[PDB]
Ligand binder design. Sequence first.
Ligand SMILES: Nc1ncnc2c1ncn2[C@@H]1O[C@H](COP(=O)(O)OP(=O)(O)OP(=O)(O)O)[C@@H](O)[C@H]1O
Ligand SMILES: [Mg+2]
Length: 496
Amino acid sequence: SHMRAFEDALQKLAKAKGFKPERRPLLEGAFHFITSSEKPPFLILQAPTGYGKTLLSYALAVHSLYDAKLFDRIIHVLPMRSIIEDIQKTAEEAFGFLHLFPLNITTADTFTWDLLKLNTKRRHRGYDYLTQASILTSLVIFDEAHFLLEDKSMVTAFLSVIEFLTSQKVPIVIMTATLSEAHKKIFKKYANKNNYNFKVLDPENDDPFIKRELKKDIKIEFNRGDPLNFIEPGRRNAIIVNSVKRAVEIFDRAKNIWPERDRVMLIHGRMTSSHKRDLINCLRKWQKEGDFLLIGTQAVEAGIDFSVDLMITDRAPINSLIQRFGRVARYKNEKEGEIIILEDAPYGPYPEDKVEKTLDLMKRGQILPRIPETYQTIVTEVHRSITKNVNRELKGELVRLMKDPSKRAPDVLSAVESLISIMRDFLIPLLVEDDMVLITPRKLLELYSKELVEIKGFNKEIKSLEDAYKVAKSVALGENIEIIFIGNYDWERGIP
Ligand SMILES: Nc1ncnc2c1ncn2[C@@H]1O[C@H](COP(=O)(O)OP(=O)(O)OP(=O)(O)O)[C@@H](O)[C@H]1O
Ligand SMILES: [Mg+2]
């Protein structure tokens, strides 16, 4: 065999999470492929939601302190909106992890700023890594995070970071339940262009996991109106919506509606890390004890491990919905669940094209979850096209800039300004008192007009979105400014 790192992680994790193992072949196959493998490996692990794919990351990480010929640490990338506190809290509790950590958990926009040599410091708080060069000595695992290609505002950048990563022959794993083949092709391209050892592992017809979940029946229904029309006390409930503001106002009423106020909970991303971890701890207590209602946004979807009897979610494109569906009957002796998609809900950040097409195709071909046969074709038809909006001459300059030591943040910033910028999505540190909260340039403006922000060390005192985009400019440059919250942070609602 020759993998006792893998089983070391499987035991230490299965202790902490209190489950008894099952062998999950694709995980083993993926671990071996990585540790074996002549060349730089480029794995696409295409496994259903709930398989246990985060194990591979844990395993590989407890394989970095023994063998370091291929990589010296693991960088685990979650999606942009995502909450990373849950994986951090089992890396810390289950395995005991500027310093060198075996397992670093980041978010996909942070990741690309880092590779663009931009200042991401207070995001990494000591600090786990702070340099492009540490990333180049890593194995980089995207955990459902490649879906930055479906964001118009980033695709050109995240593609340059895929191009550049592959150019430096960094080993790469791509974890996803929902792999389009438009996606598969641009990955395979860059993995072939740089002579990786490319490989796709999807489950095959005998998989002990798919059959565990074929036995389950989890009904999915469509509906309209207020999400609290559909709650069911006495079961584990979860309402997942597409914006934090939507989530907050549902929670403002759910606190009074739900029988036990103790068991109503709001999670989104506009909260402090301290707060997030507090909630993660309450949430793991809540799963073994009885019933509760959880209000959340997409932030809960790639990286948080919970399981809920009834789920009510907004309509969203198929990758997001599969993600969300995965959290309903997730563990093994849970065989019945219900899902309610709200076809009238607002799109939020999502493109309307893809959301509607998603809902048209599901309604034709009723899909059973965690069982790719049912959703694979929806995925490939929805999640296509990316090449349309790639500013491919900038994508070229970005890959030359990262490759060049002589070029730093100032040069990459004024490069993109020619071709205010992509800076729409450069989240900046709002400091609430000792903790912080990432917020978009635009909610920085909003919070400024309401006179809840004070900026030490910058003096144009924000109006005009372009003023905000300049705060983001200087934060990315490492300017000595502080963006401070003056209001009193709401310890259940997060930030406005
Ligand atoms: N070897 C294993 N055997 C049985 N169960 C496992 C194993 N590894 C992990 N799990 C289970 O899977 C759960 C974690 O799965 P996890 O959510 O990491 O899968 P995932 O592929 O990341 O799913 P998602 O796509 O929803 O993030 C744990 O609660 C644990 O019970
Ligand atoms: Mg995960």
